[PDB]
A paper describes a structure:
Upon binding template ssDNA, the Pol1-core dissociates from the platform, leading to a drastically different Pol α-primase structure to form the template-bound primer initiation state. The two-lobed elliptic apo structure now becomes three-lobed with each lobe being loosely associated with the central hinge, as evidenced by 2D class averaged images in which the position and orientation of the Pol1-core lobe, the platform lobe, and the Pri1 lobe vary. The significant conformational variability limited the achieved resolution of the EM map to 5.6 Å, insufficient to resolve the bound template ssDNA. Therefore, the ssDNA bound to human Pol α-primase is used as a placeholder for the template DNA in the yeast Pol α-primase. Transitioning from the apo state, the ssDNA template bound form of Pol1-core (i.e., state III) drops down 45 Å from the Pol12–Pol1-CTD platform and rotates 69° for binding the template DNA. Accompanying the Pol1-core movement, the Pri2-CTD rotates 92° clockwise toward the Pri1 active site for binding the template DNA, and the Pri2-NTD shifts 22 Å outwards accordingly. Therefore, both Pri1 and Pol1-core engage the template DNA, but their catalytic sites are ~49.5 Å apart. (2) In the template-bound primer initiation state, the Pri1 captures a template DNA thereby triggering a major conformational change that leads to the release of Pol1-core from the platform and the binding of the Pol1-core to the template DNA at a position that is 50 Å upstream of Pri1 (diagram 2).
The eukaryotic polymerase α (Pol α) synthesizes an RNA-DNA hybrid primer of 20–30 nucleotides. Pol α is composed of Pol1, Pol12, Primase 1 (Pri1), and Pri2. Pol1 and Pri1 contain the DNA polymerase and RNA primase activities, respectively. Here we report the cryo-EM analysis of yeast Pol α in the apo, primer initiation, primer elongation, RNA primer hand-off from Pri1 to Pol1, and DNA extension states, revealing a series of very large movements.
Residue numbers in the entry:
A (entry chain A): 6 to 53, 60 to 90, 103 to 390
B (entry chain 1): 349 to 548, 553 to 593, 607 to 676, 681 to 815, 859 to 882, 903 to 1055, 1273 to 1288, 1290 to 1418, ...
C (entry chain C): 248 to 318, 320 to 386, 392 to 580, 606 to 672, 689 to 705
D (entry chain B): 42 to 67, 72 to 174, 180 to 202, 223 to 250, 254 to 282, 288 to 299, 317 to 348, 352 to 381, ...
Write the structure that this text describes.
Amino acid sequence: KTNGPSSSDMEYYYKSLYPFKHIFNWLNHSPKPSRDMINREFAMAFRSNSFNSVQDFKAQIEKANPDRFEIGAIYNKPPALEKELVFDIDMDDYDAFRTCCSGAQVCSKCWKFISLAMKITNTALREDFGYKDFIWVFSGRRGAHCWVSDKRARALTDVQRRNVLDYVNVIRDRNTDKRLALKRPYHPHLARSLEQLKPFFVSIMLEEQNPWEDDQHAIQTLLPALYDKQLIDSLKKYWLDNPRRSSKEKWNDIDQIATSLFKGPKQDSHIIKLRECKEDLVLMTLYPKLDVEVTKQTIHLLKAPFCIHPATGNVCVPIDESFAPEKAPKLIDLQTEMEKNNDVSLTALQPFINQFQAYVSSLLKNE
Amino acid sequence: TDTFQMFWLDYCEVNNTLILFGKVKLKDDNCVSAMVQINGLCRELFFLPREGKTPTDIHEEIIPLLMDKYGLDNIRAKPQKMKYSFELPDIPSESDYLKVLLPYQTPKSSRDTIPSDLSSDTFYHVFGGNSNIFESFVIQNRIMGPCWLDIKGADFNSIRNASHCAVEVSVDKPQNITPTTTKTMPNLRCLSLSIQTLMNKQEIVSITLSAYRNISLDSPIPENIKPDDLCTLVRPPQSTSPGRVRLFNNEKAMLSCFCAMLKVEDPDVIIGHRLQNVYLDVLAHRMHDLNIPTFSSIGRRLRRTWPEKFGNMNHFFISDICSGRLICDIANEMGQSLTPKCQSWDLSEMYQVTCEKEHKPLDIDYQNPQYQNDVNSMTMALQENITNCMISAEVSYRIQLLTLTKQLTNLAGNAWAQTLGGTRAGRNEYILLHEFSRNGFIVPDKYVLVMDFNSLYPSIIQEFNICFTTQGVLPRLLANLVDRRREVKKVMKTETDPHKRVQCDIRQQALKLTANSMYGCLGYVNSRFYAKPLAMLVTNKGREILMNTRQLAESMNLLVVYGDTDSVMIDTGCDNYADAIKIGLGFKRLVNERYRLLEIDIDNVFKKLLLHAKKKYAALTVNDVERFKDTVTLELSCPCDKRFPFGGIVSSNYYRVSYNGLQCKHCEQLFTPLQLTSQIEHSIRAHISLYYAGWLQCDDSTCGIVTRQVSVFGKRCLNDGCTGVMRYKYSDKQLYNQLLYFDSLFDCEKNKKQELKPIYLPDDLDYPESSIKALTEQNRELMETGRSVVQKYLNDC
Amino acid sequence: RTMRQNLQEASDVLDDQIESFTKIIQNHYKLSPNDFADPTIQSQSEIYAVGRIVPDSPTYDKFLNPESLSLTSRMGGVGRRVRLDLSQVNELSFFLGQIVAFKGKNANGDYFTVNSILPLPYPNSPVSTSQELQEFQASLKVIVTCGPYFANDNFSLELLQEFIDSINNEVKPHVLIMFGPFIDITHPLIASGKLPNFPQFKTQPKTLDELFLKLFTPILKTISPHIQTVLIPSTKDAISNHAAYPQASLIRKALQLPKRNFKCMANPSSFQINEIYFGCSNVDTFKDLKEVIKGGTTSSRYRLDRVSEHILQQRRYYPIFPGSIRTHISGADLDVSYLGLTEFVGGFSPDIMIIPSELQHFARVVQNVVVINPGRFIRATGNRGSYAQITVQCVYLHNVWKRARVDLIAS
Amino acid sequence: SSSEEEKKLYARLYESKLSFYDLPPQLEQFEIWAIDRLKILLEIESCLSRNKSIKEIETIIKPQFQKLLPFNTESLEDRKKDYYSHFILRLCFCRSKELREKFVRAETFLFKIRFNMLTSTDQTKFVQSLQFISNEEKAELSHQLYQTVSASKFIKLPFENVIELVGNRLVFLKDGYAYLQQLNLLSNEFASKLNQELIKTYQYLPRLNLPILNHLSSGYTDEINAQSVWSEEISSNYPLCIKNLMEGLKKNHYYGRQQLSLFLKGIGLSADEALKFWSEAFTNPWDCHTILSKPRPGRGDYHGCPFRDWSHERLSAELRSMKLTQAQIISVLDSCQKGEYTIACTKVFEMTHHIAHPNLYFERSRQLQK
Ligand code: SF4
């Protein structure tokens, strides 16, 4: 049991490592302290608020020594008017489709679910909403938080936030024991998302995760995606007679058995319907599975970038295209680097601070 | 070591202060009487904010207005969240109130109370307006009956010649007084009084005083305890001419000496038989009649004059004048409740029942002339008085009237005097007042075996969690009482010392009586906590249990001889004490198995029972229709000219619908379709024309005019000043109904189902299925063509 | 529109008649509204007042006189009615429903004394441009008939056939205007249902609508296609299903009459034939208008002149209200809510006004308007009735009265 | 103002049959016109609270417009009545935030109904009194526009103006723009403007300082026993009318009180228990022929017969909850369509276990368990 960071490790982290100036400049939307910071809510979670300057923010967090803090709305008075539009994505809703990790483990293989979720959400935020100023942040374990800082995104009402969420949240029913039966024809966003996800389905789902090699798991999550009972009963019999066929073999058996069953002038309707079921299953397995609550209301609190995760010791760092959870620096490793070189600029944290600074510099230019 | 300590016994109200009477210990370990005057007491008022308003809003309105009326410089007030759970419908379960402390002593209008229904735009109710001062003190300071009181800041020089007490002090604020935990109490000075009267007005002939100066309730009182002093006073009943006997020439002299003796004796308790509502009244009125100046020594406050209205209020005056001395009456309601084996509660009877001693009462009549010259008669009469006096005392001690009432008072938190001289209601009231107030609630403003089922209701309230708030307050209170009673009975089984054991038995009894009286709180109609829905709820469950208790008895092959909510009598079917008791216990166990909180017991064992009623027995004890109602008929004329109403394919003496059409019965000629339809159409048009004539009629039955004149205010009647409403006399509803009726005549489905309106009443001189079906189909074409002529105008409407 | 009668709406219409005349009087005589006051209450001062002539009791005797009449709008006098004192006025003609304007005084509270009658002004006449009149130029004959067309004791249209032959081959008019009733619902054989078998019809009619198609249509069809023929109904027409005045036009297709030369018009209707404006109405105002009259000069005039002037002044073809009743059998059958449609279209007086009556046929010029009653085409007994022939010589006032000759011809 | 200048002002303010009520109008009329508009707005709110479709609401309000507030007339007086009633209600509803929000909601819905009742020509004239895309931009986006619209010229607008169409994926989205909905844009602008004008009206209201404004603002505002009648054991025996009345009484705390009071008397609720029942329920016998004869229930009423008074949609949902099959529901609805309400009710009795009295329905239901 790798114990999480001690209280003294958190004191050291806030004293010497946490990028208070960059987080303040991000949330203040200006080089000069403003009401975007003075009237911003912070919540502190302890092992058992609002700030006027970088110095006040640092001194209050150092004095309080919280295990984390969470960023809220800008208010009309010092602690809702504005807040960054936020999305949260965790691995939990992908647990039924991964074999490389169990329970609360993560690796570069299942991280591809989060990478695809970020890619599809980014496509919608950029191309459909016209947003420019967003950043992804590692949740410190097995998820990622998006922060959309465009002025138009900050000023969204709860009704508009709900409409943005309902546009991106295609998979509303997360139950894998049932066919999604998505609306046809697909909305342009959903059609585009399918074409972006299709190239990854064979390599991730059929080969790297191979979740349906297990015949009970194939009965529980592959068969319920099909529309036809005679096809389901025929596949179930065929896999009972021929156990432990790979996900790739079972994927082809679906088409072979369907072609044997559906003959004559109605066959084309069954072929179209089977293709639609396979497409709905590509989306069920790989499409973004957002936490819906954090996005809906302007007042929702979300964990600050660069917080420490209390169980893993990982820093909640900004994400680039190369990111995997094993690249997130741990507080204990950063302390060991600081013992050799008593300067944060010489630690594994500095590249992530530089990435975040470049983002904040772009945002302030757009503002 | 720096505080004045007093054991309080009684109280009285005067000039918006509260006086407590009690005992103080002196340096020689002896205890004397004392009084404490308490100033600074306030009424606790709670103002209930209006929808949208706050307590601060209330503070702004009434506080300044209250300063004016009462003439106060400042009034302590503050917001406070309080719970409400009683019978006023418009008050919420919980709210923020403005708690205002209004002193009882105010410079102005101190006798004027704030009504609960005070008009205001910030609040719509006010609790605590009519608070009683004793109640306020006891509830605010958590005083639970007679106990030791630590009193700080006692002023020993303020009070002058106010009482008949040895020690007089005062305090500026009630918070200076707190109760201590000390369980022991000082000895009490008891004085037994026996009075012999004479009917002239009831006049007093003699008085016997027996003093017991060291009655300790901390240990059992020894049987046949002898008085430290015994004295008898007497005046001559007609003319002017053991222990001490004192003779006086008249009644005024006698009563004067009596009062003087009372003052010097300074008893804490006055014991007697039927004092409360017989002899104390006679004593009071005679002292009044004879203008005895020292009359106040019957109590402990000094007055030179009687109340103005003295001469129902008489009860209060006397009780008030006696304040300071507890009235221990063995034959009042409380006394009777401890002696249920009595029937008359006559002195000799009580003596027999409680002490198993016989005294044959002499009927003394001082009207008889023999008492003026016969010295032996006078002496025997005085002996009777002396005997009665000492009997009354002995009985009061044997039935443990003081200890039991004290324990009951400590449990309910009321006044000892109220327990001794009141009904159950008082105890029931205060036990709840203390309970609720302490948990942030606002209280309302002021062989046959006899099986005991007294615990029925308190077990129901506890089992089914019945409360004003619903575990609720009342059930929790009962549970605690039952639990503590068990704790006591557990300690008894082990206790060896007879003193402590007897004490436990008293404690145990008091706890039982308290619990078994709780129902009165919500059941008694005139109770401060009366709640009919709760009473009914508890009563109904009580019936069920009793009804089922019967079935249970029968399941053991027992017979219920009699029963009610207090007791159930069962025929055991045995002729042996042992067998009877076993059956009795078996039934006891059975009842408890079905009702875990109901523990009944065997109260009476009847070897034989001659029964007539509960307390009357001898025994050996062991120890379309409406739519067309006003339409008019379609009248056809025969192309022979006879006229007749046409009612469809129905019977008629004038016409027949035959297989080849409508036929006239007078001349046998058949109508052609045009001969029928031209007439249908002609009638329709006559109706439509009448309708367009536009006659109007007035509503008002005393006017009724019909006219075609229409005022430029259409509905207005043209009769000077008539207020009726004008309506088209042929309404468009009536026209439409008339046409729908015509339509029905030529409707095949309606003809076949025989649903048309009759053309003739039974008494009409022209009163007239398978034929109708057939004839209707044979004439379908005629019908439909007749019908189309009506429809020409129905679609156009 | 359906058969609804709504009292509020009827009263609205009656109110509006008083108010619109109040504005016509004020513009014509150039008076200010402050000169008008409530005649139902006492004043010291003479006032102008406008109102409707009504009886002085709502349950009144059949026969009225100058001592038994009353006169306000809702704004004028809260709709109150006040008895008229006409003793200071020597010459007058009033009728029930007439809108009138007075100068007078209510001296004591219970009567309004009329000092003078302000006559309502005659409506303007239509005009035409020189271009329009030249097109019309590039004599006009109009024939007018009015039902009944068959007698009371038979179903002969022999006289109508004779007439049709005459107009087709001799008279050759440009337009023929025919007023109902065609099949009169109060014809006594129709009323009693004494309708015979017709041997000249292969299939007998089953309804009065079918009786029209078999009896009238084939004869009407023989009118020359060169003669435009206009049909205007009566509220007594069995063939109409709208038995109130104003009355919707008949439906030509339903009557199976040819489009080539038949037009069905409303009752009333107004139209032009070339420049000439016709106003046609088929309720018998001339029979029904019962004047209350004072004065030798008024009484020595011809009744038909006085009645025509009342109609022109009132600017509506049947100004009597309540409308007359035939006692129930028939009547004016006014649909009060739609009296609006019976007002002179555009506020214009017609050049020719045709209002058939059961009185003797007549043609008269009154206030430069040609007023024509053609009389009934056939008499009840079966004797010849009459019809009217109008011959008219071929911005500008039409002066039809100067150019028109009207003959009343035995049919 | 001479009556002619006033007429010219109203001719200019009403070139369209619809108005945003931008300019102020230049006692019996004041009160009647306010009451007549207020009745229409309360009927709108009553229909909205009952989740009626826009087309059902349009059908109910159409006869009320002809009676109380004629729209689409050339009458100057009807146009005046519409203006003045709107501005008079601004004075009534400006006083509290809740009154403003209710008025803006009802008035914006009234605007939507009236706009839908206009001709396409009158709608276009009103809009003239929303940029279309070029044919090139349409050609570039043609595939994505067609895919979006297939299930259902293009207008390009910020997506924030069509959030309701975005949530349903009825509009195409690119770069923060929606490719379309004009009525929703106009309704939001109307609602925003009206809310701003109500705030301004409230700021000036102290200078106007009343009985009519106060009144109009306020116009918007035993086995069988008092407890057992609310229990499933007893209530499972009630017919639908008694169910309706009940659910109401519970939700909201004359005709309905009489129908329910007399029914409860008929089932054996004593006088004393009935007074407890009503006192407790106010927290803040007729046969079917008689019930049906009473004035029809309106918004806020629960008397009458649900088989006549409820839509087939509402009845079907209720009958589905009662476990009735589709064939059974069709049979009940067929009776309703025929006006045979007691037959429909008898069918429900039989299918859930001729009756023409609610007390007989209850008694028969109880007899089946005894
Ligand atoms: S038919 Fe009668 S009992 Fe049934 S719901 Fe209707 S009114 Fe009630």
